[PDB]
Amino acid sequence: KTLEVWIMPNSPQPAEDFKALVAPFEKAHGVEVKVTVLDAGVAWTKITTAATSGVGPDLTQLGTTWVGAISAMGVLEPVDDVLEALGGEKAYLPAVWRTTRLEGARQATAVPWFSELRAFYYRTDALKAAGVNPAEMFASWQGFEAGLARLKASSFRDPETKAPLAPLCTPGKNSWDVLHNAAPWIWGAGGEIVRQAGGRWQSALNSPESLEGLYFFLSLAQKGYVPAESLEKNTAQIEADFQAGKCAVFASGPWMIQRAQVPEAKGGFAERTAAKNLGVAPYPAGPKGRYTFFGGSNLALFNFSKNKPLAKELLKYLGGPEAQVRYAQMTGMLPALRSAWSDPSFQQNPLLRTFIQAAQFGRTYPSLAGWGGVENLAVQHLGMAWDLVAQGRLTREALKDLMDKASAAINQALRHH
């Protein structure tokens, strides 16, 4: 009776890394664990098909935003026992603990595996030449826009491109990335994507505070601080532009830290000026607070598994300190288990300590059963606002009107089962 785990492509050799990760467990339990890697755009199909049919793995990886929807289908084994075994609620950042259950449930259905959090990379050489103190550019909204204005004015040129750097690269192409790149600006203004109000869940995208945050961010791209060509690039293309010395500032996760230490000859960018002049800073505080976007993945046990006892031991293993530290070398992500962040692999690296500083401000979306329909509508409407940005036509009224249509659509979505 062999355990079957479904994972996503979390690391460069994902199945191999998973197998090396669980080798100690396999030896101590005298078993092999079988792993299947789901590519990005079959994963949700496969996991919902397993849920409806009862034909599936023992364990599956779930994105943190999927936990509510799969939990609500009645197919996940409770794992409150596993979480207690790992230290309970105090073992996690609150934003991470929120991803263990359907929103408002008392019962956990997912075990935190790894976190994806986002912070600003910057060129230390470019900010020095522009006269910009990184501490004050990334401390506040006013600092951030003043930094980008100095970066625009700067005579500095990249030593290898012999060209100027764009102040800020951010994508404007409807993807899940656009809502998470917007979320800290929404949150820092005092806004939300959805909230509880008046006895219901509702959109808050058209609240004055959400609109202040969204407008602050999107307007930077209309002020000359984001190149036109950045708005149609995906997240991989923006990362490649930063490596190639085209971008002074961009937002990413911790994986870029490792890639900057790997030579070009093995797929990294150690040789590039950007690697040798690399800074990280958390998102700036808005007028109502400082937030860092959390996502990542959790693990869940299908309650139709015939191997539930062994599968819960594997959940405890994967969720626990040693496996949390090890997998992080492989994924480029932060452990979901907060005690793992003390490991010297993080604490002896000044850029990873900065991500752990950023982590203290972590926030995530509400764990709603209907989150994916909310996020689809939010992303489509935000991409309509980015499309106005591409024309130089985003005004506060135009953004309000888009978010009023977003919020009508969201509100109707949340009214349905």
Q: Which is nearer to Cl ion, 230 or 364 (CB)?
A: 364
Residue found under tokens 């997998």: 327
Closest approach of Cl ion to the CB of residue 117, in Å: 12
395 near Cl ion (CB under 5 A): yes
Say if CB 375 and CB 176 are below 8 A apart: yes
**200, 276, 396, 415: which one binds Cl ion (CB under 5 A):** 396
**364, 370, 386, 402: which one binds Cl ion (CB under 5 A):** 364
Token output for 39: 């590519």
Q: Which is nearer to Cl ion, 156 or 215 (CB)?
A: 215
Of the candidate spans 81-89, 97-105, 148-156, 242-250, the one that interacts with Cl ion by CB under 5 A turns out to be: 97-105
Angstrom distance (rounded) from CA 92 to CA 301:
20
Closest approach of Cl ion to the CB of residue 36, in Å: 31
DSSP, residue by residue, 227-269: -GGGGG--HHHHHHHHHTT-EEEEEE-THHHHHTTS-GGGTS-
Of the candidate spans 30-38, 107-115, 241-249, 361-369, the one that interacts with Cl ion by CB under 5 A turns out to be: 361-369
Q: Which is nearer to Cl ion, 298 or 364 (CB)?
A: 364
Token output for 202: 């509702």
With b for 16 or more beta-carbon neighbours within 10 A and e for fewer, the 402-413 pattern comes to bbebbbebbbeb
| End-to-end Cα, the chain, rounded Å | 37
Closest approach of Cl ion to the CB of residue 292, in Å: 10
Residues 173-232 that bind Cl ion (CB under 5 A): 192-193
Q: Which is nearer to Cl ion, 56 or 286 (CB)?
A: 286
Closest approach of Cl ion to the CB of residue 187, in Å: 7
Token output for 384: 């309509």
Number of residues engaging Cl ion in binding (CB under 5 A) = 8
Of the candidate spans 91-99, 148-156, 172-180, 385-393, the one that interacts with Cl ion by CB under 5 A turns out to be: 91-99
Residue found under tokens 């991500």: 355
Radius of gyration of the chain (CA): 22
Phi, psi of 325 (to 5 degrees): -65, -50
Q: Which is nearer to Cl ion, 95 or 315 (CB)?
A: 95
Of the candidate spans 156-164, 262-270, 333-341, 362-370, the one that interacts with Cl ion by CB under 5 A turns out to be: 362-370
Angstrom distance (rounded) from CA 172 to CA 247:
16
Residues that bind Cl ion (CB under 5 A): 95, 98, 192-193, 363-364, 395-396
